[PDB]
Amino acid sequence: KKDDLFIKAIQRVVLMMGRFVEPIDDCPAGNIIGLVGIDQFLLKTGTLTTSETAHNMKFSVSPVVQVAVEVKNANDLPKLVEGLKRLSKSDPCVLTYMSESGEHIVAGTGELHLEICLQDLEHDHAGVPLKISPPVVAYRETVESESSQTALSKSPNKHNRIYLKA
Amino acid sequence: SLARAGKVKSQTPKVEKTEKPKKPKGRAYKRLLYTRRFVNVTLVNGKRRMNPGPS
Amino acid sequence: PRAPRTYSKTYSTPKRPYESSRLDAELKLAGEFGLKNKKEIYRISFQLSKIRRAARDLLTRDEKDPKRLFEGNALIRRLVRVGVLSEDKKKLDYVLALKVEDFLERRLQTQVYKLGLAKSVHHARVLITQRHIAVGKQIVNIPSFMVRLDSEKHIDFAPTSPFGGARPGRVARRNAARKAEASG
Amino acid sequence: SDAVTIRTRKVISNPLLARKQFVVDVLHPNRANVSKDELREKLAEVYKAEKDAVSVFGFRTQFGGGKSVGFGLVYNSVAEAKKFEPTYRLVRYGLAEKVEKASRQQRKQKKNRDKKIFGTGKRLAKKVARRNAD
Amino acid sequence: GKGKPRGLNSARKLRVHRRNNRWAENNYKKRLLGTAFKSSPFGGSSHAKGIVLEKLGIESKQPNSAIRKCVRVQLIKNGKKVTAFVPNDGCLNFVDENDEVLLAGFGRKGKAKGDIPGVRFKVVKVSGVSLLALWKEKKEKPRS
RNA sequence: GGAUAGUGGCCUACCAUGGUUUCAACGGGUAACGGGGAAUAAGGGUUCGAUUCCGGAGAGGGAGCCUGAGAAACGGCUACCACAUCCAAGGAAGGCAGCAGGCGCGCAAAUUACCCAAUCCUAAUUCAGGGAGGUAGUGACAAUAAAUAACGAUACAGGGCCCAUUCGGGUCUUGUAAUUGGAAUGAGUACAAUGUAAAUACCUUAACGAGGAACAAUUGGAGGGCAAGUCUGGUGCCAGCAGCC
């Protein structure tokens, strides 16, 4: 069954030389190479086969710091969404997601991630000014006694009486 | 109160579809129309009614 | 660079499509002669529209005009060739009196019924779309064949079909195989 | 194979290049179609030219089967066919061999590579080779 | 007689008189003056995308006592405040905030649709997901 | 008199004060390249026409120039303007409104595929080259045709008419069936053949391919215009419906 499979054809294979990419006709059954034309949509690193079945092939310090990002410019929602999507594309270990805030909280294994995505969201795919926010929190409530005093309810219809304990 | 968006939509009861073999379509649909409207004389009483309620 | 390919619609919806005076009579026609859709019948109305318009501006002028006599003589030859026009009326007046049926009973969907080989207009469709009738020497698949008054002398069953020989049948052979396997 | 009854139509001869052009109609009841291999030499015994000197192309099948119409062409002699018939059809018949070649881009990439280099490059080759050596 | 001249060589007189008369059409006038281009917030466009900023609770006219749950949407190319109306029930929460909705007309060609004033356009798509298909539970709207 | 290949205020020195204009000059806007045409309709007419054909303008905005018969050429250069690549910090290399493909933009628009086999063009020329072009891929922009189903036998209900032997048969019918039966090809499979530069497409045809639980056809409405409920359950000026009332 097709889970995340696509049948796009190879555009061109290349061999990079210090960002001076030169064209390559074909490549052997080994050695690392550069490839373009079939990335397009991507979520995480994977592999590629040709046969029907074609059976084929964790890091230290998990992301810890969560920081919300809000763009200063008003008309930036499509721009912000595109920027975060291609940031996730370019970051193989990031785990950003909307969370409760819904502002696509930025994750990272240490504050060096915050430092690098500073200049990233400043002069990269986003290319827009923005400010940071304190990390989101999630605090619940509970009870620890047995309702020493009874409860009551009031309404315009005063005949409704409720007596409950917690 | 804007929170009442589709208020009655939520209060409506849950009714599911009933099993029914598919009605033939194409020239059979035109055939099905003829065999029950013109040649059929079941409903020709006063106005040639074709969706009457329970009377 | 390419030469554009000419195309033209062969149907036209009426100005009033929402009224009960015409749908009932139209429902009768589709059921009587067994037509799946009704885009075909507005096409027939389009067929009558062009000849009526061609006839309308033909009689606007006087007689003995060389183009008028050619167009009149050429036209009446077509209708008598297909058969929608009788063989004893060539006064350029009956070419305006055609009604919707006259261009519709000439359809191959009804010719086989008139020959008694279908027993119903809908069963005739069961002989047409499944290539079980050969209006000419070669098998056809078009219900709207527009016979030209000479197919009746040439009509015959399809060669590669039952009642025409050369084969017993497809599912008939399959049923025989099942019977032979069950018997053994 | 049931009553093939091969038959030609509109046969005209032109000694300009020694060929006979005609359109052939074949009716084959109880048969799906006729392949090219046996379709070629059935004209050999009716025209006495040669089995492989004949040439046939097209043969569009009419709707419903049992009849094929297309263009057929017979040749005076084999030796004429080599330098008259285009080589793109001898590969279909097997008389000639299709020249092995890559796609059209490889020739374009090669052509501009020689275009950007002036001369044979034989003198430039070792001078660059020595320059990279030291 | 009968007003307009009927002279053989008078053609230019009633030709220009025709031009001034057809100047009074609602169709002729705004077609050339570009009111749909310089004043309308669509720029001659059948549909346009926008960003919802906040919601509105505008009431209706007599004799209806109801609110249509209108929303405020800002365009991109033009950039002026524009009101929008939620078409169907329960879609207000799907157009709550920060949704890349698309605007569409009402069929009135530049006036109020019904009993809800201050509104002239409606929304049919949200972030590439149509509202009617979601109302039929055919597709899903991405949260972000 | 100069320059042009040519006539000409094209330009030059002199002379005259003139030329057009309410018969719409001149200036402004054009979501203005023009035409051949397209949509719409008895007629008249209105709108559109960048878009396959013809004639014009452009290669980011101008200006200048050689070669060349033919250029103010930009897939030829020179300088500026605003972008913009490589720097081993001296310098050098460029203008996709050419074929694909990318970004920003937008309601809005496809593949960085194969071939000169076709219709031609170019050169020294039959042979070579051409993202001119053709083929294929996406594609519900628009056009044509056309699947999703029919036919027998039993149980009811009928119309002429035969006996007038009682309300008995009903011999020919047309429909409803918690009735059953055979024949029938198509979509999808494709052995094979034709097709095509090789294929992928069409038709033919070994063979596999319905009994509905199946091989499942939807978009809207049912107060009026606008034909389609005084049917059932839920909400009760609230949700809402509604292009109009």
* B42 Cβ nearer than 7 Å to chain F strand: no
Q: What is the distance in angstroms between the Cα of E68 and the nearest Cα belonging to chain B? A: 9
Positions of strand F less than 7 angstroms from a protein CB? 23-24, 29, 31, 48, 52-53, 87, 104-108, 112-118, 129-134, 142-152, 159, 174-176, 182-186, 191-199, 202-209, 212-214, 216-217, 219-220, 222, 225-231, 233-235, 237-245
Residue among A40, A33, A36, A30 at smallest CA distance from A6: A40
Nearest-angstrom CA–CA distance, A128 and E16: 57
Experimental approach = cryo-EM
* E113 Cβ nearer than 7 Å to chain F strand: yes
For the CA of D69 and the C1' of F8, the distance in angstroms is 68
On whether the CB atoms of residues D4 and D26 are closer than 8 A, the answer is yes
Residues from chain E that touch B8, judged by Cβ atoms under 8 A, are 89
- Using a CB–CB cutoff of 8 Å, tell me whether A104 touches chain E: yes
Assigned domain for C12 exists? no
On whether the CB atoms of residues E73 and E50 are closer than 8 A, the answer is yes
Residue found by looking up tokens 């009509």 in the block:
C155
Helix or strand run (H / E) with residue A111: helix A111-123
Residue found by looking up tokens 């007309």 in the block:
E105
Q: Can you identify the CATH homologous superfamily of domain A58-140?
A: Elongation Factor G (Translational Gtpase), domain 3 (3.30.70.870)
Q: What is the distance in angstroms between the Cα of E127 and the nearest Cα belonging to chain A? A: 9
Nearest-angstrom CA–CA distance, E131 and E102: 10
Tokens (6 digits) for D25? 């109609």
On whether the CB atoms of residues E107 and E101 are closer than 8 A, the answer is no
Number of domains in chain E: 1
The residue in chain E having the minimum alpha-carbon distance to the alpha carbon of residue A81 is E144
What's the start-to-end Cα distance of chain B, in Å? 43
Contact call for C and D: 3+ CB–CB distances under 8 Å: yes
Interchain proximity E90–B8, CB inside 8 Å: no
In the stretch 11-40 of chain B, residues with CB closer than 8 A to chain C read 26-28, 30-31, 33-35, 37-38
Number of domains in chain C: 1
Number of domains in chain D: 1
Residues from chain D that touch C138, judged by Cβ atoms under 8 A, are 62-64, 66-67
Strand F proximity: list residues 112-141 of C with CB under 7 Å: 119-120, 122-123, 125-126, 129-132
Task: Using the CB atoms, write b or e for A75-88: b if 16+ within 10 Å.
Answer: ebbeebbebbbebb
**Counting every residue, how long is chain A?**
166
- CA-to-CA dists, residue C32 to A27, A153, B31, E14, E108, angstroms: 70, 74, 8, 59, 44
Residue among E90, E47, E48, E100 at smallest CA distance from E69: E90
- Using a CB–CB cutoff of 8 Å, tell me whether D64 touches chain C: yes
Assigned domain for C6 exists? no
DSSP code for A148: S
- Which residues have C-beta within 8 Å of that of residue D64, sequence separation ≥ 6? C131, C134, C138, C139, C140
**Counting every residue, how long is chain C?**
184
Give the structural domain span for C183.
17-184
Residue among E135, E66, E126 at smallest CA distance from E101: E126
On whether the CB atoms of residues C102 and C80 are closer than 8 A, the answer is no
Q: What is the distance in angstroms between the Cα of A21 and the nearest Cα belonging to chain E? A: 36
Assigned domain for C5 exists? no
Interchain proximity A81–E143, CB inside 8 Å: no
Nearest-angstrom CA–CA distance, A70 and A64: 20
Resolution for this experimental structure (Å): 3.9
- Which residues have C-beta within 8 Å of that of residue E26, sequence separation ≥ 6? none
On whether the CB atoms of residues C84 and C102 are closer than 8 A, the answer is yes
The nucleotide whose C1' lies nearest the CA of E44 is F31
Q: What is the distance in angstroms between the Cα of B8 and the nearest Cα belonging to chain E? A: 9
Quote the strand ranges of chain A, DSSP E.
12-15, 22-24, 34-36, 68-71, 130-133
DSSP code for C148: -
Residue type at C58 in one-letter notation: L
- Which residues have C-beta within 8 Å of that of residue C2, sequence separation ≥ 6? none
Dihedral sign computed on CA atoms, order C62, C68, C73, C76:
negative
Quote the strand ranges of chain D, DSSP E.
8-14, 19-26, 55-61, 68-75
Task: Using the CB atoms, write b or e for A1-40: b if 16+ within 10 Å.
Answer: eeeeeeeeeeeeebeeeeeeeeeeeeeeeeeeeebeeeee
- Which residues have C-beta within 8 Å of that of residue B32, sequence separation ≥ 6? B23, B24
On whether the CB atoms of residues D26 and D71 are closer than 8 A, the answer is no
- Using a CB–CB cutoff of 8 Å, tell me whether E143 touches chain A: yes
Cα torsion through A26, A30, A36, A40, rounded to 10: 130
3-state secondary structure of C122: helix
Give the structural domain span for E28.
1-144
Assigned domain for C1 exists? no
